[PDB]
Amino acid sequence: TSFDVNKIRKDFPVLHQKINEYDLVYFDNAATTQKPKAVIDAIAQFYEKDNSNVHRGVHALSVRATEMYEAARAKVKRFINARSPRECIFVRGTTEAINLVAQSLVAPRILPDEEILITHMEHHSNIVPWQMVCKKMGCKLQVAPISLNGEVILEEFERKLNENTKMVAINYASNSLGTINPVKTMIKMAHEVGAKVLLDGAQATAHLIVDVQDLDCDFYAFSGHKMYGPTGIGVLWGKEELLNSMTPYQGGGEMINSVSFEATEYAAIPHKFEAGTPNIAGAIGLAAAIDYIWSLDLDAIAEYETQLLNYATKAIEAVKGYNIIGTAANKVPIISFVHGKIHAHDIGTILDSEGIAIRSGHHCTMPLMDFYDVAATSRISMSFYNTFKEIDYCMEALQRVKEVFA
Amino acid sequence: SFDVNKIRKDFPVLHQKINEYDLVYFDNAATTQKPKAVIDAIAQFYEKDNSNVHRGVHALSVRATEMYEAARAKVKRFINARSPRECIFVRGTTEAINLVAQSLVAPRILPDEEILITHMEHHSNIVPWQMVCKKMGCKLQVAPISLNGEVILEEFERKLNENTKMVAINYASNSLGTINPVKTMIKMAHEVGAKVLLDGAQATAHLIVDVQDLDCDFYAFSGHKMYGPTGIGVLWGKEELLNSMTPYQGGGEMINSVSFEATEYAAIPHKFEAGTPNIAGAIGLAAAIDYIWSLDLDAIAEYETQLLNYATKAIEAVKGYNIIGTAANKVPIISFVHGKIHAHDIGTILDSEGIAIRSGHHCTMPLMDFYDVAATSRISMSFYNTFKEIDYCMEALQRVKEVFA
Numbered sequence: 001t002s003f004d005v006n007k008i009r010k011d012f013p014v015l016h017q018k019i020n021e022y023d024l025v026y027f028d029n030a031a032t033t034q035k036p037k038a039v040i041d042a043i044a045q046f047y048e049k050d051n052s053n054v055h056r057g058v059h060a061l062s063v064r065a066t067e068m069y070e071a072a073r074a075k076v077k078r079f080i081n082a083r084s085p086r087e088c089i090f091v092r093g094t095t096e097a098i099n100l101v102a103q104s105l106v107a108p109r110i111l112p113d114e115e116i117l118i119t120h121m122e123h124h125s126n127i128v129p130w131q132m133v134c135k136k137m138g139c140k141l142q143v144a145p146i147s148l149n150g151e152v153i154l155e156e157f158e159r160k161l162n163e164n165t166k167m168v169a170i171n172y173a174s175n176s177l178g179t180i181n182p183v184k185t186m187i188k189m190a191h192e193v194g195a196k197v198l199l200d201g202a203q204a205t206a207h208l209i210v211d212v213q214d215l216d217c218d219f220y221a222f223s224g225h226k227m228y229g230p231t232g233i234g235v236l237w238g239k240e241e242l243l244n245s246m247t248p249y250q251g252g253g254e255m256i257n258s259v260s261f262e263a264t265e266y267a268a269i270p271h272k273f274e275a276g277t278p279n280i281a282g283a284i285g286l287a288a289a290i291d292y293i294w295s296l297d298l299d300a301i302a303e304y305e306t307q308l309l310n311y312a313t314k315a316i317e318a319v320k321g322y323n324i325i326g327t328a329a330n331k332v333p334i335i336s337f338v339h340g341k342i343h344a345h346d347i348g349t350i351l352d353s354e355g356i357a358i359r360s361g362h363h364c365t366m367p368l369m370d371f372y373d374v375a376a377t378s379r380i381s382m383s384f385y386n387t388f389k390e391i392d393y394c395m396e397a398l399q400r401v402k403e404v405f406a
Numbered sequence: 407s408f409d410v411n412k413i414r415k416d417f418p419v420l421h422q423k424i425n426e427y428d429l430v431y432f433d434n435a436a437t438t439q440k441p442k443a444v445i446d447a448i449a450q451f452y453e454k455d456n457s458n459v460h461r462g463v464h465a466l467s468v469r470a471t472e473m474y475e476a477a478r479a480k481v482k483r484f485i486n487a488r489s490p491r492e493c494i495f496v497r498g499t500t501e502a503i504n505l506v507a508q509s510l511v512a513p514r515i516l517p518d519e520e521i522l523i524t525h526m527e528h529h530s531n532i533v534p535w536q537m538v539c540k541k542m543g544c545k546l547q548v549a550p551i552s553l554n555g556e557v558i559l560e561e562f563e564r565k566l567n568e569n570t571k572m573v574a575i576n577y578a579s580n581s582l583g584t585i586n587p588v589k590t591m592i593k594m595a596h597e598v599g600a601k602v603l604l605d606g607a608q609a610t611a612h613l614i615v616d617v618q619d620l621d622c623d624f625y626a627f628s629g630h631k632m633y634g635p636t637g638i639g640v641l642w643g644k645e646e647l648l649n650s651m652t653p654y655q656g657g658g659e660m661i662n663s664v665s666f667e668a669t670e671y672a673a674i675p676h677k678f679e680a681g682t683p684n685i686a687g688a689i690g691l692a693a694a695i696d697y698i699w700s701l702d703l704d705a706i707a708e709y710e711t712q713l714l715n716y717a718t719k720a721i722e723a724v725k726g727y728n729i730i731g732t733a734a735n736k737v738p739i740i741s742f743v744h745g746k747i748h749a750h751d752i753g754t755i756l757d758s759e760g761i762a763i764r765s766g767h768h769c770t771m772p773l774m775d776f777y778d779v780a781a782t783s784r785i786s787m788s789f790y791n792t793f794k795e796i797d798y799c800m801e802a803l804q805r806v807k808e809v810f811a
């Protein structure tokens with residue numbers, strides 16, 4: 001490979017520690033990612049130099065901080081190829097973004113004879129908000145099936161679309177399976193029946209170039225902490241005409257133009273959807289994460305992460321006894337797997353005893369676990385700072401897990 | 407006896423110039439500055455411990471989860487909650503109030519039933535209730551204030567009736583500085599069966615919070631207004647009430663089980679924390695609580711009262727400026743007006759001399775209407791401000807008078 005992972009790993013202080021006698025091997029990136037020094041420093045510098053509240057200020061630090069905050073929004077626009085920064089809303093995370101759409105677009109409009117369509121592989125954060133709407137409003141949640149290899153069955157997705165489908169909310173890349181779904185095609189199908197389409201981009205945004213104009217999604221949601229940025233910050237993007245037509249979500253300061261006891265007038269987007277003091281430092285840290293990603297080049301990241309995924313896929317199958325769940329043709333670098341006798345929890349615990357961090361559980365996809373007739377899977381989820389040597393060590397530890405239960 | 411010179415060394419942002427002038431940061435009611443201990447706690451988390459929390463098997467996840475739940479426990483101690491389970495992490499006071507409006511009040515309140523607030527509420531303790539009134543048909547009632555900036559208690563009591571289901575009241579005012587007699591008001595509200603939320607966004611930086619003694623049913627505050635990071639705040643509520651409320655946001659982490667046939671929700675507090683929480687913000691907030699405790703809130707209050715008294719006398723001695731909000735009990739905030747000079751010009755010219763204040767409506771437009779002004783200028787102080795800073799501010803305010811002589 002041409003990707004200088006040894007140099008890149010120097011940017012991530014957390015990677016250089018031991019877990020008892022063992023080097024940390026951080027293979028839990030789908031749960032959250034580690035941060036480069038550039039992101040940590042951007043947050044610290046904000047508090048050390050520029051901190052003040054944003055908008056409607058007169059003084060120098062407030063003026064500086066406000067332009068830094070709106071500059072972060074503009075960088076988000078460039079990062080996802082939005083038409084305008086006013087379409088880019090700062091939230092806590094993907095979960096809040098989806099709840100905002102569910103309550104501000106769908107709940108005030110959907111009728112009892114209408115439908116919301118999702119896929120079987122959704123994360124709970126792209127299931128529960130829609131279940132809440134259906135319970136209150138009487139509409140039906142429909143679920144498009146997947147095949148055993150972890151791919152959406154496109155013919156059945158199309159069959160579940162109809163003139164009553166008003167909202168389609170679909171996973172871009174799966175945190176459990178790794179599958180990258182053909183979302184541009186799925187969006188085109190959904191638009192043919194008149195539905196609006198939200199993409200859950202929590203995993204995809206760390207690994208692929210996001211272009212919301214090319215995809216033609218109506219909404220796009222992602223989380224900063226899953227893409228090398230701080231916790232507590234995420235983005236809801238939506239088409240301007242839709243966001244304008246939606247009701248506000250949370251109410252209070254900053255999202256109004258005027259408040260009286262006789263009338264309240266709301267602000268224009270994006271501020272319409274940012275109630276109260278925003279997570280100013282989180283937005284600035286997210287902008288630093290985007291700059292960091294761009295400095296590595298997303299094409300270079302994707303080439304290397306493909307090499308990691310291919311190498312680990314071949315290596316875990318060569319260990320013998322472990323079966324991969326999720327073998328789609330297009331994947332982000334995630335491998336879920338099971339053993340026919342050894343419980344997922346024991347795999348994860350024993351791997352951690354050798355410094356290796358994975359996730360063993362349902363990965364917030366309990367309906368997927370049900371589909372695969374398993375209680376849990378174990379999940380290796382990699383990033384561009386992981387290495388072939390780490391993969392080798394992980395496979396040696398998985399062989400020792402077999403030997404514990406020989 | 408308060409060693410402000412030593413404390414100021416903890417706040418790196420204070421040590422800079424705005425053009426040729428030392429920064430004088432008098433905008434603490436908008437947001438506060440952070441001590442190195444808080445900045446370092448956030449950086450150290452990302453440098454050493456970062457991982458997602460709960461349901462993890464590996465060392466960093468276990469460490470991060472213990473740190474996150476320990477932060478919740480520190481919040482409990484900080485406000486004297488009965489249990490950490492009652493303490494919910496949100497983005498800020500605004501989100502906390504929306505959560506209660508949507509999860510307690512909207513699913514229960516009937517048309518013509520009433521929500522009672524005071525005239526001095528911040529917009530974040532007005533708009534959520536207006537949203538519920540518009541959708542559910544209930545009625546928003548407003549308890550009046552007197553010209554000195556105090557709640558008129560007799561009229562607050564008069565506005566309470568058998569149909570008052572929710573009372574949401576300011577603890578300390580970001581615009582006036584007033585500290586309201588919330589323990590008495592809560593007793594009055596409970597006599598008619600109402601639940602009471604306290605907006606503690608300003609009070610929590612300046613007073614010892616004891617939710618058990620106040621007997622409020624909910625308490626909301628923001629980390630960034632009490633020396634902590636942005637993006638983190640707290641909703642506290644009585645356990646029995648939180649258990650009876652519907653969830654607010656839905657998704658990962660706040661469930662026990664999800665299927666397409668049935669979804670079972672987690673117990674409090676996790677019931678109300680959907681998706682990955684702001685883990686680093688909670689840890690930074692715990693560092694802010696530790697820092698406040700290291701100074702002692704009794705000592706902070708004594709010194710901040712000295713600052714307020716000194717600045718109140720000094721600005722009245724300048725002549726030409728009138729204080730808005732002269733309550734008997736105040737946090738260290740002075741809003742003021744001039745009869746001819748616009749607030750925007752006061753704030754702009756003060757900033758030209760390095761002095762950071764706020765000139766505007768302070769998210770209390772109905773208060774501005776009550777006082778028949780469009781805006782006020784606001785000095786809002788913290789324990790790292792000094793008498794010399796106050797002197798310089800007043801000299802700058804005299805120069806403003808001379809600009810428009």
Ligand SMILES: [Zn+2]
Binds near residue numbers: 253529769
């Ligand atoms: Zn406002």
Ligand SMILES: [Zn+2]
Binds near residue numbers: 124363657658659
């Ligand atoms: Zn979950």
